[PDB]
Amino acid sequence: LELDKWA
């Protein structure tokens, strides 16, 4: 998957 904004 999928990252978050602040990564």
Epitope: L1, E2, L3, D4, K5, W6, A7
Partner: antibody, heavy 123, light 108 residues
Framework: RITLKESGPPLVKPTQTLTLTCSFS??????????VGWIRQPPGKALEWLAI???????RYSPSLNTRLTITKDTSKNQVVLVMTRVSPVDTATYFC???????????????WGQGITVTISS | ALQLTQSPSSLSASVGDRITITCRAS??????LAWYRQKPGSPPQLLIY???SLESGVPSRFSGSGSGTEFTLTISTLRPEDFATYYC?????????FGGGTRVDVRR
């Protein structure tokens, strides 16, 4: 400082729709980054992440509850609404809404939570 | 899908004891992991944010460490108000994920 709170019907019937509402006050959804998510906790089990909505409107749901959840924000009231459809006894739990940060690095954690409003399903 | 299964899952300790509870992640989550203490009756409380940062207003006895896949949250000295359930949450991947919970009850 920041305090959110949960509203809605404590008692809900199998099939229908559960509309919960998070009223916060200490921040606005106009502040940049600021997010408000929904976390729910079955009777005596663990926390389960539901969905999150940010200042500028993106929204990520829970892959497993995606086709049943809908998150919105009305910036004039400072409430966040979460609609979860076709509920069943398994959706009986305590639902929390929480405030997440915004870059000033510590936008890394849900720092303040509503107090919780426990919903129970039962026709 | 981002498993993360928190170790020691039901401590049994006294006041003054020193315990270290862990939270494992199936995929690296930078340092985007938070720790909470919930005490029956109410909502989760933030203790550690960004894996190692003590949240303002939280007792100095709580501390956090780790990065990537391993994270720990130590209680230098166990207080009465510490007997509760603790949770870890990563906010690096969507969906944001909570561990199963570790609980520490009074030992007898």
């Amino acid at each position: 400082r920041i305090t959110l709170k949960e509203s809605g019907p404590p008692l809900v019937k199998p099939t229908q729709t559960l509309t919960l509402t998070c009223s916060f006050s200490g921040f606005s959804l106009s502040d940049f980054g600021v997010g408000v998510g929904w976390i729910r906790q079955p009777p005596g089990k663990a926390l389960e992440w539901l969905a999150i909505i940010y200042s500028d409107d993106d929204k990520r749901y829970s892959p497993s509850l995606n086709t049943r959840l809908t998150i919105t924000k009305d910036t004039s009231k400072n409430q966040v609404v979460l609609v979860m459809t076709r509920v069943s006894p398994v959706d009986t739990a305590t639902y929390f809404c929480a405030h997440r940060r915004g870059p000033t690095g510590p936008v890394n954690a849900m720092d303040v939570w509503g107090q919780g409003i426990t919903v129970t399903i039962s026709s | 899908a981002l498993q993360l299964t928190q170790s020691p899952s039901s401590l049994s300790a006294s006041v003054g004891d020193r315990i270290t509870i862990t939270c494992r992640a199936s995929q690296g989550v930078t340092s985007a992991l938070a720790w909470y203490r919930q005490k029956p009756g109410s909502p989760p409380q933030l203790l550690i944010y960004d894996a190692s940062s003590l949240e303002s207003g939280v007792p100095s006895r709580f501390s956090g460490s780790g990065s990537g896949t391993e994270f720990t949250l130590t209680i230098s000295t166990l207080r009465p108000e510490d007997f509760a359930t603790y949770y870890c949450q990563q906010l690096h991947f969507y969906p944001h994920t909570f561990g199963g919970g570790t609980r520490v009850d009074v030992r007898r």
